[PDB]
Amino acid sequence: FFKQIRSDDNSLYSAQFDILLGTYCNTLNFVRFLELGLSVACICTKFP
Amino acid sequence: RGMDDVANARVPADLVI
């Protein structure tokens, strides 16, 4: 790339840019079984 | 934007429900 210019050449005073405008997301919520109303409908136990 | 990643007044206005 070789460009030579005289005393004054235009296109030395330009500005171009694409800024980001932010990033968003969501946090998933976890539900538990015993907190629901379906827990008074059965008895939960566990055998290893 | 940012470039730091290291890794009131009472106004009269009606309100309904």
CSV table of N, CA, C and O in Angstrom, one decimal:
chain,number,residue,atom,x,y,z
A,1,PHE,N,0.9,-1.2,0.0
A,1,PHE,CA,0.0,0.0,0.0
A,1,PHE,C,0.9,1.2,0.0
A,1,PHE,O,1.6,1.5,1.0
A,2,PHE,N,0.8,2.0,-1.1
A,2,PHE,CA,1.7,3.2,-1.2
A,2,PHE,C,0.9,4.3,-1.8
A,2,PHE,O,0.5,4.3,-3.0
A,3,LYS,N,0.6,5.3,-1.0
A,3,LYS,CA,-0.1,6.5,-1.5
A,3,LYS,C,0.7,7.7,-1.0
A,3,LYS,O,0.8,7.9,0.2
A,4,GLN,N,1.2,8.5,-2.0
A,4,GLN,CA,1.9,9.8,-1.6
A,4,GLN,C,1.0,10.9,-2.1
A,4,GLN,O,0.2,10.8,-3.0
A,5,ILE,N,1.0,12.0,-1.3
A,5,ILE,CA,0.1,13.1,-1.5
A,5,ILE,C,0.9,14.4,-1.4
A,5,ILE,O,2.0,14.5,-0.8
A,6,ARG,N,0.3,15.5,-1.9
A,6,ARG,CA,0.9,16.8,-1.8
A,6,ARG,C,0.5,17.5,-0.5
A,6,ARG,O,0.2,16.8,0.5
A,7,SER,N,0.7,18.8,-0.4
A,7,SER,CA,0.5,19.5,0.9
A,7,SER,C,-0.8,19.2,1.6
A,7,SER,O,-0.8,18.9,2.7
A,8,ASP,N,-1.9,19.3,0.8
A,8,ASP,CA,-3.2,19.1,1.4
A,8,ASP,C,-4.0,18.1,0.5
A,8,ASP,O,-4.3,18.4,-0.6
A,9,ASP,N,-4.4,17.0,1.2
A,9,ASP,CA,-5.3,16.0,0.5
A,9,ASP,C,-6.4,15.8,1.5
A,9,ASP,O,-6.2,15.7,2.7
A,10,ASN,N,-7.7,15.7,1.0
A,10,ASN,CA,-8.8,15.5,1.8
A,10,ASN,C,-8.8,14.0,2.3
A,10,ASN,O,-7.9,13.3,2.1
A,11,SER,N,-9.9,13.6,3.0
A,11,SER,CA,-10.1,12.2,3.5
A,11,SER,C,-9.0,11.9,4.5
A,11,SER,O,-8.6,10.7,4.6
A,12,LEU,N,-8.6,12.9,5.3
A,12,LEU,CA,-7.7,12.6,6.5
A,12,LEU,C,-8.5,13.0,7.7
A,12,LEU,O,-7.8,12.9,8.8
A,13,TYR,N,-9.7,13.3,7.7
A,13,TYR,CA,-10.5,13.8,8.8
A,13,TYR,C,-11.9,13.1,8.8
A,13,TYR,O,-12.9,13.7,9.0
A,14,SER,N,-11.9,11.8,8.7
A,14,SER,CA,-13.1,11.0,8.7
A,14,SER,C,-13.2,10.1,9.9
A,14,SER,O,-12.2,9.9,10.6
A,15,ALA,N,-14.4,9.7,10.2
A,15,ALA,CA,-14.6,8.9,11.4
A,15,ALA,C,-15.8,7.9,11.2
A,15,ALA,O,-16.9,8.4,10.8
A,16,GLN,N,-15.6,6.7,11.5
A,16,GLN,CA,-16.6,5.6,11.2
A,16,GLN,C,-16.5,4.6,12.3
A,16,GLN,O,-15.4,4.1,12.6
A,17,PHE,N,-17.7,4.3,13.0
A,17,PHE,CA,-17.6,3.3,14.0
A,17,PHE,C,-19.0,2.7,14.3
A,17,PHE,O,-20.0,3.5,14.2
A,18,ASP,N,-19.1,1.5,14.8
A,18,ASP,CA,-20.3,0.8,15.1
A,18,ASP,C,-20.2,0.3,16.6
A,18,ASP,O,-19.7,-0.8,16.8
A,19,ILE,N,-20.7,1.1,17.5
A,19,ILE,CA,-20.6,0.8,18.9
A,19,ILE,C,-21.7,-0.2,19.3
A,19,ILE,O,-22.8,-0.2,18.7
A,20,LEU,N,-21.4,-1.0,20.2
A,20,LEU,CA,-22.4,-1.9,20.8
A,20,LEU,C,-23.3,-1.1,21.7
A,20,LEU,O,-22.9,0.0,22.2
A,21,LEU,N,-24.5,-1.5,21.9
A,21,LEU,CA,-25.5,-0.8,22.6
A,21,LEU,C,-26.0,-1.5,23.8
A,21,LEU,O,-27.0,-1.2,24.4
A,22,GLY,N,-25.3,-2.5,24.3
A,22,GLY,CA,-25.6,-3.3,25.5
A,22,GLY,C,-25.8,-4.7,25.2
A,22,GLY,O,-26.1,-5.2,24.1
A,23,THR,N,-25.7,-5.5,26.3
A,23,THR,CA,-26.0,-6.9,26.3
A,23,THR,C,-27.0,-7.3,27.4
A,23,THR,O,-26.8,-6.8,28.5
A,24,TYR,N,-28.0,-8.1,27.1
A,24,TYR,CA,-28.9,-8.6,28.1
A,24,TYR,C,-29.0,-10.1,28.1
A,24,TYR,O,-28.4,-10.8,27.2
A,25,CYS,N,-29.6,-10.6,29.1
A,25,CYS,CA,-29.8,-12.1,29.3
A,25,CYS,C,-30.9,-12.3,30.3
A,25,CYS,O,-31.5,-11.3,30.8
A,26,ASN,N,-31.1,-13.6,30.6
A,26,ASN,CA,-32.1,-13.9,31.6
A,26,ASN,C,-31.6,-15.0,32.5
A,26,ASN,O,-30.7,-15.8,32.1
A,27,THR,N,-32.1,-15.1,33.7
A,27,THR,CA,-31.7,-16.1,34.7
A,27,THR,C,-32.9,-17.0,35.0
A,27,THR,O,-33.9,-16.5,35.4
A,28,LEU,N,-32.7,-18.3,34.7
A,28,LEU,CA,-33.8,-19.2,34.9
A,28,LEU,C,-34.1,-19.4,36.3
A,28,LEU,O,-33.2,-19.5,37.2
A,29,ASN,N,-35.4,-19.6,36.7
A,29,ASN,CA,-35.8,-19.8,38.0
A,29,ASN,C,-36.1,-21.3,38.2
A,29,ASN,O,-36.7,-21.9,37.3
A,30,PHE,N,-35.7,-21.9,39.3
A,30,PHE,CA,-35.8,-23.3,39.6
A,30,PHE,C,-37.0,-23.5,40.6
A,30,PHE,O,-37.2,-22.7,41.5
A,31,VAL,N,-37.8,-24.5,40.3
A,31,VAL,CA,-39.0,-24.8,41.1
A,31,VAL,C,-38.7,-26.1,41.9
A,31,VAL,O,-38.0,-27.0,41.4
A,32,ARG,N,-39.3,-26.2,43.0
A,32,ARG,CA,-39.2,-27.4,43.9
A,32,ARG,C,-40.5,-28.1,44.0
A,32,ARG,O,-41.6,-27.5,43.9
A,33,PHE,N,-40.5,-29.4,44.1
A,33,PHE,CA,-41.7,-30.2,44.1
A,33,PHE,C,-42.5,-30.0,45.4
A,33,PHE,O,-43.7,-29.9,45.4
A,34,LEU,N,-41.8,-30.1,46.6
A,34,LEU,CA,-42.5,-30.0,47.8
A,34,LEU,C,-43.3,-28.7,48.0
A,34,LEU,O,-44.2,-28.6,48.9
A,35,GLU,N,-42.9,-27.6,47.3
A,35,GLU,CA,-43.5,-26.3,47.5
A,35,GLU,C,-44.8,-26.2,46.7
A,35,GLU,O,-45.6,-25.2,46.9
A,36,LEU,N,-45.1,-27.2,45.8
A,36,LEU,CA,-46.4,-27.2,45.1
A,36,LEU,C,-47.5,-27.8,45.9
A,36,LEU,O,-47.3,-28.3,47.0
A,37,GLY,N,-48.7,-27.6,45.4
A,37,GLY,CA,-49.9,-28.2,46.0
A,37,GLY,C,-50.0,-29.7,45.8
A,37,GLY,O,-50.9,-30.3,46.4
A,38,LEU,N,-49.2,-30.3,44.9
A,38,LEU,CA,-49.3,-31.7,44.6
A,38,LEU,C,-48.6,-32.6,45.6
A,38,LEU,O,-48.7,-33.8,45.5
A,39,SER,N,-48.0,-32.0,46.6
A,39,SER,CA,-47.4,-32.7,47.7
A,39,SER,C,-48.3,-33.3,48.7
A,39,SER,O,-47.9,-34.2,49.4
A,40,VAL,N,-49.5,-32.7,48.9
A,40,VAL,CA,-50.4,-33.2,49.9
A,40,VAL,C,-51.3,-34.2,49.2
A,40,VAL,O,-52.3,-34.7,49.8
A,41,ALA,N,-51.0,-34.7,48.0
A,41,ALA,CA,-51.7,-35.7,47.3
A,41,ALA,C,-51.0,-37.0,47.3
A,41,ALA,O,-51.5,-38.0,46.9
A,42,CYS,N,-49.7,-37.1,47.9
A,42,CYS,CA,-49.0,-38.3,47.9
A,42,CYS,C,-47.9,-38.2,49.0
A,42,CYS,O,-47.7,-37.1,49.6
A,43,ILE,N,-47.3,-39.3,49.3
A,43,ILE,CA,-46.2,-39.4,50.3
A,43,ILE,C,-44.9,-39.8,49.6
A,43,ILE,O,-44.9,-40.8,48.9
A,44,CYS,N,-43.9,-39.0,49.8
A,44,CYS,CA,-42.6,-39.2,49.1
A,44,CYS,C,-41.6,-39.7,50.1
A,44,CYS,O,-41.4,-39.2,51.2
A,45,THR,N,-41.0,-40.9,49.7
A,45,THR,CA,-40.0,-41.5,50.5
A,45,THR,C,-38.9,-41.9,49.5
A,45,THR,O,-39.0,-41.7,48.3
A,46,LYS,N,-37.8,-42.5,50.0
A,46,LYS,CA,-36.7,-42.9,49.1
A,46,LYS,C,-35.9,-44.0,49.7
A,46,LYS,O,-35.6,-44.0,50.9
A,47,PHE,N,-35.6,-45.0,48.9
A,47,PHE,CA,-34.7,-46.1,49.2
A,47,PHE,C,-33.4,-45.9,48.4
A,47,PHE,O,-33.5,-45.8,47.2
A,48,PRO,N,-32.3,-45.8,49.0
A,48,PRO,CA,-31.0,-45.8,48.3
A,48,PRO,C,-30.8,-47.1,47.5
A,48,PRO,O,-30.0,-47.1,46.5
B,1,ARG,N,-19.2,-0.3,23.5
B,1,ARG,CA,-19.7,0.5,24.6
B,1,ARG,C,-19.0,-0.1,25.9
B,1,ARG,O,-18.6,-1.2,26.0
B,2,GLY,N,-18.9,0.8,26.9
B,2,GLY,CA,-18.3,0.4,28.1
B,2,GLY,C,-16.8,0.3,28.1
B,2,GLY,O,-16.0,1.1,28.6
B,3,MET,N,-16.3,-0.8,27.4
B,3,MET,CA,-14.9,-1.1,27.4
B,3,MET,C,-14.3,-1.1,28.8
B,3,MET,O,-13.4,-0.3,29.1
B,4,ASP,N,-14.9,-1.9,29.7
B,4,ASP,CA,-14.3,-2.1,31.0
B,4,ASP,C,-14.4,-3.6,31.4
B,4,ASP,O,-14.2,-4.0,32.6
B,5,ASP,N,-14.7,-4.5,30.4
B,5,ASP,CA,-14.7,-5.9,30.7
B,5,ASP,C,-13.3,-6.4,30.9
B,5,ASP,O,-12.5,-6.4,30.0
B,6,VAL,N,-13.0,-6.9,32.2
B,6,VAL,CA,-11.7,-7.4,32.5
B,6,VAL,C,-11.6,-8.9,31.9
B,6,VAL,O,-10.5,-9.3,31.5
B,7,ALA,N,-12.7,-9.6,32.0
B,7,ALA,CA,-12.7,-11.0,31.5
B,7,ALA,C,-12.9,-11.0,29.9
B,7,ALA,O,-12.0,-10.6,29.2
B,8,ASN,N,-36.0,12.5,40.6
B,8,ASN,CA,-37.4,12.2,41.0
B,8,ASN,C,-38.2,13.5,41.2
B,8,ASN,O,-37.6,14.5,41.7
B,9,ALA,N,-39.5,13.5,40.9
B,9,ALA,CA,-40.3,14.6,41.0
B,9,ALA,C,-41.8,14.2,41.1
B,9,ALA,O,-42.2,13.3,40.3
B,10,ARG,N,-42.5,14.8,41.9
B,10,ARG,CA,-44.0,14.6,42.0
B,10,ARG,C,-44.7,15.3,40.9
B,10,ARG,O,-44.8,16.5,40.9
B,11,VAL,N,-45.3,14.5,40.0
B,11,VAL,CA,-46.0,15.1,38.8
B,11,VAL,C,-47.5,14.6,38.9
B,11,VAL,O,-47.7,13.4,39.3
B,12,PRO,N,-48.5,15.4,38.7
B,12,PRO,CA,-49.9,15.0,38.8
B,12,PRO,C,-50.2,14.2,37.5
B,12,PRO,O,-50.1,14.7,36.4
B,13,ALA,N,-50.6,12.9,37.7
B,13,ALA,CA,-50.9,12.1,36.6
B,13,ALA,C,-51.8,10.9,37.1
B,13,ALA,O,-51.4,10.3,38.1
B,14,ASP,N,-52.9,10.6,36.5
B,14,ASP,CA,-53.8,9.6,37.0
B,14,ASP,C,-53.2,8.2,36.8
B,14,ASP,O,-52.4,8.0,35.9
B,15,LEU,N,-53.6,7.3,37.6
B,15,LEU,CA,-53.2,5.9,37.6
B,15,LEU,C,-54.4,5.0,37.9
B,15,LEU,O,-55.0,5.2,38.9
B,16,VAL,N,-54.6,4.0,37.1
B,16,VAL,CA,-55.7,3.1,37.3
B,16,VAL,C,-55.1,1.7,37.5
B,16,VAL,O,-53.9,1.4,37.3
B,17,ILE,N,-56.0,0.8,38.0
B,17,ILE,CA,-55.6,-0.6,38.2
B,17,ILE,C,-56.5,-1.5,37.3
B,17,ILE,O,-57.6,-1.8,37.7
